[PDB]
Amino acid sequence: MTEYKLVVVGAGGVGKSALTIQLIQNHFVDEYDPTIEDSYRKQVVIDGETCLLDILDTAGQEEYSAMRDQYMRTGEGFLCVFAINNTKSFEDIHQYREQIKRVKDSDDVPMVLVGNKCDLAARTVESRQAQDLARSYGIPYIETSAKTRQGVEDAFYTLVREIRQH
Numbered sequence: 001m002t003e004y005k006l007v008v009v010g011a012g013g014v015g016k017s018a019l020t021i022q023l024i025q026n027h028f029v030d031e032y033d034p035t036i037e038d039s040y041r042k043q044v045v046i047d048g049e050t051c052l053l054d055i056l057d058t059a060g061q062e063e064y065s066a067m068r069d070q071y072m073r074t075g076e077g078f079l080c081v082f083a084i085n086n087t088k089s090f091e092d093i094h095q096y097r098e099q100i101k102r103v104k105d106s107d108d109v110p111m112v113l114v115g116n117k118c119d120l121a122a123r124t125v126e127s128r129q130a131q132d133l134a135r136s137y138g139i140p141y142i143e144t145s146a147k148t149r150q151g152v153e154d155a156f157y158t159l160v161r162e163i164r165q166h
């Protein structure tokens with residue numbers, strides 16, 4: 001079956017791992033559990049296509065940039081995750097996108113901008129700001145909550161469909 005290598009990137013603590021574990025294990029992880037590097041493999045059916053999602057969960061910590069680069073290089077699509085209550089993680093998005101472009105030697109790779117933690121009332125990044133940024137990149141913007149599962153399959157499935165169109 002087709003394998004899609006998806007890479008989840010973003011600042012530390014935005015919920016990269018919680019998003020992935022919701023998709024894979026249907027559970028919200030409320031624990032503090034920083035990632036170094038983790039891989040998940042799941043057989044799914046997306047629009048009648050049997051395929052294998054190979055999800056590379058990366059570290060937000062700068063100490064693992066070289067490790068992150070190595071895994072970014074193999075990815076076919078990228079979830080760029082920020083948290084809607086963390087303005088700095090939204091600002092960091094530009095830096096993550098540029099590194100993706102660097103290691104993939106491409107100006108446009110399949111990518112989804114993911115505004116996570118939308119269950120929180122304490123929003124500091126307006127949806128309009130993130131939509132505008134996504135529009136400038138040419139990529140879709142999807143708001144998610146790993147807690148309520150809102151948007152989770154949307155984010156991953158939209159990325160897979162973007163790889164089909166690439």
Ligand SMILES: Nc1nc2c(ncn2[C@@H]2O[C@H](COP(=O)(O)OP(=O)(O)NP(=O)(O)O)[C@@H](O)[C@H]2O)c(=O)[nH]1
Nearest residue numbers: 012013014015016017018030034035060117145146
């Ligand atoms: N309310 C809420 N909390 C969330 C959400 N996603 C993650 N969190 C919380 O935010 C914290 C960080 O989550 P985690 O998935 O570990 O983030 P990460 O991006 O993988 N961090 P790292 O870069 O170290 O691997 C955890 O306490 C988790 O429960 C969400 O959608 N809503």
Ligand SMILES: [Mg+2]
Nearest residue numbers: 016017034035
């Ligand atoms: Mg993590």
